[PDB]
Amino acid sequence: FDNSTYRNLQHHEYSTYTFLDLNVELSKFRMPQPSSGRQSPRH
C-alpha cells in the first residue's frame, strides 16, 4: 500500500471516438426500449 502515484493515467490514451466506441460496445447490454406507439410526434 502507498499513496504515492496517480492512478488516472489511462485517459492519456483516449482518442476522438473513444466515447462512441464505448457506447457501441454497451449497445448489446441494454434492455429493449419503451415505445410511445408512434414513429414520431408528427406521425
Add this chain to the structure above:
Amino acid sequence: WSSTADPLSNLVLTFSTKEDAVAFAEKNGWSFDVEERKVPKPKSKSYGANFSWNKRTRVSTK
C-alpha cells in the same frame, strides 16, 4: 378630395343592450338588421401538453 352627399355617413350610436338599440331604431322609423353578439368560446389550455409522451401536441421547439 372625397365628396359625399349623404348626411348620415358619420352617424354611429352606442347602446348598452341590443333591445335599447332596437327600440331607438323603431321609434325613429328606421328599418334595421340585428346581428347576434359573437363571444369567443372557452378553451382548454395546458402548458404540460407541450411535452406529451405519446400525443401530437408535443412541440418541436420553444
